[PDB]
Amino acid sequence: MKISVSKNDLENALRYLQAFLDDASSIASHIHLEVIKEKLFLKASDSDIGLKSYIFTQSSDKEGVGTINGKKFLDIISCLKDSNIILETKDDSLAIKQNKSSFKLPMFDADEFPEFPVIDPKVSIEVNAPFLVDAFKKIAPVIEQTSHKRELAGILMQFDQKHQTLSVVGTDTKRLSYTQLEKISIHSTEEDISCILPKRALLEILKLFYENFSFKSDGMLAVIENEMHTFFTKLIDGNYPDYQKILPKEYISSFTLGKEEFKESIKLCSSLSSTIKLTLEKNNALFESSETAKTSVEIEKGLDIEKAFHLGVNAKFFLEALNALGTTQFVLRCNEPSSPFLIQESKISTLMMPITL
Amino acid sequence: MKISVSKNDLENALRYLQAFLDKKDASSIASHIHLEVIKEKLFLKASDSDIGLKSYIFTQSSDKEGVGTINGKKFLDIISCLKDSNIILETKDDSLAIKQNKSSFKLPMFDADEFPEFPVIDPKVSIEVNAPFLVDAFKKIAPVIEQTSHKRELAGILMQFDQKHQTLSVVGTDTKRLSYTQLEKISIHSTEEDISCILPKRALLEILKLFYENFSFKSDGMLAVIENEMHTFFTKLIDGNYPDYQKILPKEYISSFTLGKEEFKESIKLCSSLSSTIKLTLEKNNALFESLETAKTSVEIEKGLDIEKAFHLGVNAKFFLEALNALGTTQFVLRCNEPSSPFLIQESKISTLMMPIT
Amino acid sequence: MKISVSKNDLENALRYLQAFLDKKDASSIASHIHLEVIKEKLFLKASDSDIGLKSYIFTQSSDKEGVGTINGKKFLDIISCLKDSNIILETKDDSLAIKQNKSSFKLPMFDADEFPEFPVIDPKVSIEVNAPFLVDAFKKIAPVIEQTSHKRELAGILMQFDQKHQTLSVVGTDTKRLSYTQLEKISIHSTEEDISCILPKRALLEILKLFYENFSFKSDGMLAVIENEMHTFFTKLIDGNYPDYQKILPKEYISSFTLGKEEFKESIKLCSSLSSTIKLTLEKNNALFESLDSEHSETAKTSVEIEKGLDIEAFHLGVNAKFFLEALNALGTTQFVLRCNEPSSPFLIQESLKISTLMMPITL
Amino acid sequence: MKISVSKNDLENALRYLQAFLDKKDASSIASHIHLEVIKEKLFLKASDSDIGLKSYIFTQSSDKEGVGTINGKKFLDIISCLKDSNIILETKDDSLAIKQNKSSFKLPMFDADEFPEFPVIDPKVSIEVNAPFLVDAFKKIAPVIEQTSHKRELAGILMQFDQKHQTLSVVGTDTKRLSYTQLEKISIHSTEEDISCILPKRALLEILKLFYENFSFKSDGMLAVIENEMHTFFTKLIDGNYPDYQKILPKEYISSFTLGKEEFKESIKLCSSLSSTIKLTLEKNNALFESLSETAKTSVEIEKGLDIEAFHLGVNAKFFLEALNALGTTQFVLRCNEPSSPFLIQESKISTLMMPIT
Amino acid sequence: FIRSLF
Amino acid sequence: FIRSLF
């Protein structure tokens, strides 16, 4: 601020910013306020990630800067009425006013709020289709934030300028989920270039972005930008493993199976245990957890098998793999019961390690 | 033509398009949605002469590009019955095939060359809208405008461009209340003449569903075209001359009372349960409301008004509410001359002039 | 009269009473709700001759007992505008005063002695209902009954008491489908052995809102009164003889097919997007569904696998989609039985291992 | 045993029973729900030792009557996964079979004769409750009671029967606030004249889910049994003597201020966003609220001026709100002597005595 | 702090 | 008990 009037546009801006805050003694716990013309600009950052956002002002009597504790600011705004709220700096205090209610909060020197990074892009793309963010959404569940292998704690973005391809890859060592987007105009200095986005960053991207944004990276940070927001995250330093070297080249069998039938059957048995025995027969699939859950689905289009094929699976992994698919039916390819098996549509594939017995 | 599309994307596109169809007559091309695949996009159009919308969704696969038409209502009905999986769309001769695992539909198509093309206009006026203020003003003024007006020209909202002063005035009236705002600092790319567009109420209500910020507005005096990244929208304009609102606004008010918005809203809701007209009595330290068998209620005014005798005023409840809904301040100003003369309502953007009742 | 009542309690009582008013004509006493305070209860009554409801709420205070009336619609309008606090109700002369804080309402009252009394009947039949089965049967049979029937008697649901065999048969029809169930083990306290009550559809739909378990049902052949702890409800019965449903039910069926309920429901919803009538083709391991001629170029088709193969030489059957769905909504089993004879003859729908629906097919 | 039951009926019964299980230890019989079919009813029981519930649902078919037991948590898990159709329940040796279409479950049963029977008490006190007032009072007083109190006896709500005057007093405290009401005109059928039952907080919260009107309450000083048409509920009582609340209630108050409930509620919510304690300053025509470098302030006007020559009072926000939530009137009375002495809150019928902050 | 009522 | 893929 300097003296602005503004709506509960504010509340919304402040909700999204909470995730980017850090310890109330720290500047990182504060949201940086800045009025330029008819816009209040809001920034929050804790080193790893950052967000810039803005709202329009109902009046701008004076331009200026400020800071305020980000959590406390939201708490106060969420208590006020759906009318205009006056924001005003008085010395080192931020004044929030509405009718007969007036609040004061202490500010840090806004020059000591850290600046958002300006990077020199090594790679840069414009995203107009939802496919990238659809792939993030679907691959996110397979990635764990706290991985023994530091590099696996995010999602991989593998740019190949030469072929116009952006490969998106997630793993936790028990499943590997991947997709490759065609026809991306990749403006990059090197031909090949990999960014690993942390999981925390990935989950924030999902809340803020879908279509019509820029993605730039310099190998250290990655900046995503649209008309409302500039977002930054640090990348995971490290080399993501070569996923293509682990994908089996050949599968002995490939079974076309009904997605929602399998989903429902796996939910059923998952009420008694997290691991499921799946038995594929020619015209039937059976699912089994002193206790027992069992259920079966018919397969009209008989499978190519003489002897029945047993397979131990984690219920939740199999479900998450099927949620990645948009087709009504899916393909399960496997070699031996103990060997990895693949799940895919009639863009996202999931390679999965089975369980024994 | 041969594509696969996500059920949710399609259904959504088709919902928004329903309003642009002439569903009443299925013999007409106007009852159809025009389909077109270009690269990785399915483009959907509907139009009934007065208004039109172009929209698109991305394809999950594009095995063949092409064109088609389909009955717009029937298309939505079918898609809304299918599962949240991909749906195959495919032309076969003069039929559209909709397919999803074992369920297959056929519908007859019109010749897609006889679907009318969307208009290309030469803009007489053109602006780019990044703030929400225009569409906020539409939203707040829309209630005052009635679709079926004795005066043809009042059946929409006015957009009055003054290039010379960079102003876009937005105005609505039935003949009993006039609501208006003027937006400053608009780069109006037009000629040096003034220029007025009257958008029909039907068009106005569709704009509210489709647009908020970051769009273009162009008009040529006949049509008006609104465009953003997802949509092109068109509407015919209303042909009349909107009356000069500035001539009926009183230049001076004897009194001006600063009053509490939510207190007045709640009090007017209360009395409205029994009658649509309300007697409002302003006293120095309170305001009383009475239905015109009986509802009464009162609110305290701490900051005493400048009056010797009390001031009575007959008002339409719903008009007074709709006027207060237009305001974003916590308090409002009511300016009046005599009880029988028009009175004004405004903040401590949108003002409403209102005729009282006797 | 002088009471205080909670806004929520009152609003709720008043919503339920709206259906019992003659709102059409505000000059009438029938447009009013009758108010009566006895001790710590406000009793509310509304009636328009055909149906009536008595209800009550507890008072937060009862400073004075008394009677009153008020326009039922206007009363609800006012209460719904007030805050979730206590509301004062008070008579003053021929006005009802409603007050809450600074808001005060006045409404004119009719003489409350001229509000008509609720009927006291001498029961010809009387039962106590503890299980939900009767009201479950109402719920499921109600859709088949139409309020505006050419035949006056079909415009309600039948209750056929047979004291001798302890059975209450519940029956609905519109001439194209007949839906029925028979409840066993009902202690029927009745003067005659056999006795039929036909409840009007309007009454039936109100019973569904107000009652489920633990209520009395009494009739005298003219009215029928339903009562529990909160409510007394009355309705006039349809004067007339309901047709003998048992004479039209086929005694034997050539075939009987065990089929999957939700599979059939989904498939019928699908084809019903293009046309209201569906061709259903039963094969040994497959059932197929096709929309019927609709606009010549249109078609909907879909199919479901039947694992437990049927016993047949293929069987085609024209059905109304919405009728078939409403029949399947009556069932609580996961699978259902379809029994048929010829394609043109009536067919039956019922559970696999209460409610059955006999249905007339369509040709081609 | 062999029955069919509706999925929704069962699931619902099983949800309510979860609270009555000792889920932590599956070796125990107390982790199981006891099943019993009598005629057209499936009766379900769960109990730990402290509390217990009997419930029932109607059967869609009863091919065989019998008894059984099943792990209560696992049973619910399974039923919630099944479709909204009938579910077959059936005993086979020492297993319970749950079946629906192609899905079949087996679970091990304990000998159902070793499931403990519900207590039959000889009532020392007994009442029939038709009005909602008792349970309304439980609801409003429950928040002031804490499950884990230094003083064991305060860890519940008190029911104080006085047969002589036909009164049931209901009392809750955590030492900082005392909330109470007295119900008149209770037909108390009791052996002694005076008799107190302390219901544990856990039991109290379960009573709120299960009961409202039309139930019996019986106690024998050890257990208390509540019963209606659907349920029999039991709880152990807290052994101990609840303090004499009447001895701590001030008999006289120097001042008594009639004040607006929602005004105060809203003002206290506001200042509560910054701190849990609030300074409240009562002036003749005004009440001011301030959080106790940061500041929240707000004020409300009191038109009907108080009998004052200003009165400051430190209060816990959430306590003051919970006290005002107990009231049904639009205005409330605050009675106080000194700023440091307890003050009372009541309607203009639950009263709350509260210790200020100092 | 708050003093105990008892 | 699960195998390790990487």
Numbering used by the authors:
A (entry chain D): 1 to 22, 25 to 291, 297 to 353, 364 to 374
B (entry chain C): 1 to 292, 298 to 353, 364 to 373
C (entry chain B): 1 to 313, 315 to 354, 364 to 374
D (entry chain A): 1 to 292, 297 to 313, 315 to 353, 364 to 373
E (entry chain G), F (entry chain L): 370 to 375
From the study:
The co-crystal structure belongs to space group P212121 with four monomers making two dimers (first above the second) per asymmetric unit. The binding of the peptide to the binding pocket of beta clamp is dominated by hydrophobic interactions. One noticeable thing is that residue Thr175 of β-clamp in both the chains makes hydrogen bond with backbone nitrogen of Leu560 from the peptide, suggesting that this must be a conserved residue in the protein-binding pocket. A comparison of the native β-clamp structure with the peptide-bound β-clamp structure showed differences in the positions of some of the residues at the protein-binding pocket of β-clamp. The residues involved in peptide binding reveal the maximal local displacement, the positions of residues Lys176 and M370 of β-clamp were found to differ between these two structures compared to native structure.
The sliding clamp is a ring-shaped protein complex that encircles DNA with the help of clamp loader in an ATP-dependent manner, and slides along the DNA.
